From Swiss-Prot:
Protein role: Regulator of peptidoglycan synthesis that is essential for the function of penicillin-binding protein 1A (PBP1a).
Cysteines joined through disulfide linkages: C100-C298
Gene this protein is translated from: lpoA
UniProt keyword RNA-binding, yes or no: no
Protein's recorded name: Penicillin-binding protein activator LpoA
C-alpha cells in the first residue's frame, strides 16, 4: 500500500543515499505505490519509524548506514507489524521476523569466488585478505563456503603489504595454484608483479574492488592484469546502451556510484517480492546486482558475474 524509504540524503552519506534513491525511483517508474522519503541525516531512526507508523506505513526500505541499523538491532520491537528491508548487513546477526537485509557486501563476493574457484577445479587456494576487521570478515565468508564445497578449510592469510602475498606462496609447499585476493586495483597489480618471478602461471581471482574506472582505462594496467578474473555486478555486462552511457556520464564514470544505483533498483525489486523472499525456499531473483536469494536469517545473498582482463580488454567470462 505505502513504502517509507530511509536513506541519508544530506550530510555524510548523501552521495550514497541520493544515488540509491535514483536507482530506486527509476525502477519504481510509474508505480501507484506511494513512497514517503525519510532523510536519516535529519531525523533519528527511532523518530522516523514513529512518523512512518503514524502515517500508516507498514513497509520500509532502509536504513543504510551501519549506525542506523544498530538502532533497530538494539530494539527490534519498534518495527513489529512492519516489513523492513534494511540496506545493510552483518556477517553474524540474528533472525528478526519481517526484517530482511540487503547489502552489497564483500562477503557476497567472497562466497562467489569460492564457488567459482571450486567449479574451475582449483584446490588448496591461497586466500589473501587485508589484515583488518573487514579482511577477517570476508576471509571467514570465503572459508565457510569453501568448507561446504571442499570439505576442508581454506588457506586464509592476512597481508599488510602486497609483497606479503609472495611470502605466503614461498612459505607453503610448491603447490599453490590459485589466489583469491581482496585489494585495491593498484595493490592487486603490485601483488601480481611480485608473483611473476615466483609463480608466473598463478590463477588470480579478485573482487570488484579490483575494478575501478581510473585503472580500467589505463592500457598498462590492463596489460599487467592480463588473466586476472574478478567478480562484479551483471549490470556491467552490456555498456553500449544510451541508458548506460547516460548513467556513466552522470556518475563521472565511477563504478562505485553505478553499483549503488543498481542497488537502489534491486531494492525496489526486492521490496515488492518481500513475502516471497521470506517464504519460498530456494527463491531467486535476477537483479542488476546479481542473482539474489535469501538465507535462513533473510540476509540477501548475491551470485556474482565474472569478468576477466584479456588481451587489452575486459570481457565477461564464458
Amino acid at each position: 500500500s505505502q513504502i517509507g524509504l530511509l536513506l541519508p540524503l544530506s550530510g555524510d552519506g548523501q552521495i550514497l543515499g541520493t544515488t540509491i534513491q535514483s536507482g530506486f525511483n527509476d525502477a519504481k517508474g510509474n508505480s501507484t505505490i506511494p513512497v514517503q522519503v525519510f532523510d536519516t541525516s535529519m531525523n533519528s531512526v527511532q523518530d522516523i519509524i514513529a512518523q512512518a507508523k503514524q502515517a500508516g506505513i507498514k513497509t520500509l526500505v532502509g536504513p543504510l548506514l551501519k549506525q542506523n541499523l544498530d538502532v533497530i538491532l538494539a530494539d527490534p520491537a519498534q518495527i513489529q507489524g512492519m516489513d523492513v528491508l534494511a540496506l545493510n548487513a552483518t556477517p553474524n546477526s540474528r533472525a528478526i521476523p519481517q526484517l530482511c537485509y540487503y547489502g552489497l557486501s564483500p562477503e557476497d563476493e567472497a562466497e562467489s569466488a569460492a564457488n567459482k574457484m571450486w567449479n574451475d577445479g582449483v584446490r588448496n587456494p591461497l586466500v589473501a585478505m587485508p589484515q583488518n576487521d573487514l579482511g577477517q570478515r570476508v576471509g571467514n565468508a570465503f572459508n565457510v563456503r569453501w568448507q561446504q564445497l571442499a570439505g576442508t578449510d581454506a588457506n586464509i592469510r592476512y597481508y599488510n603489504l602486497p609483497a606479503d602475498v609472495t611470502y605466503f606462496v614461498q612459505e607453503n609447499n610448491s603447490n599453490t595454484t590459485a589466489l583469491y585476493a581482496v585489494a585495491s586495483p593498484t595493490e592487486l597489480a603490485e601483488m601480481k608483479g611480485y608473483l611473476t618471478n615466483i609463480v608466473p602461471n598463478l590463477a588470480i581471482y579478485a573482487s570488484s574492488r579490483a575494478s575501478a574506472s581510473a585503472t580500467n582505462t589505463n592500457t598498462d594496467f590492463i596489460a599487467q592484469m592480463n588473466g586476472v578474473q574478478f567478480s562484479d555486478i551483471p549490470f556491467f555486462k552490456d555498456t553500449n546502451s544510451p541508458q548506460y552511457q547516460k548513467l556513466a556520464k552522470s556518475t563521472g564514470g565511477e563504478y562505485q556510484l553505478m553499483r549503488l544505483y543498481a542497488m537502489g533498483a534491486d531494492a525496489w525489486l526486492l521490496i515488492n517480492q518481500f513475502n516471497e523472499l521470506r517464504q519460498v525456499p530456494g527463491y531467486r531473483l535476477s537483479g542488476l546486482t546479481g542473482i539474489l536469494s535469501a538465507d535462513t536469517n533473510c540476509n540477501v545473498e548475491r551470485d556474482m558475474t565474472w569478468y576477466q582482463y584479456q588481451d587489452g580488454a575486459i570481457v565477461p567470462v564464458v
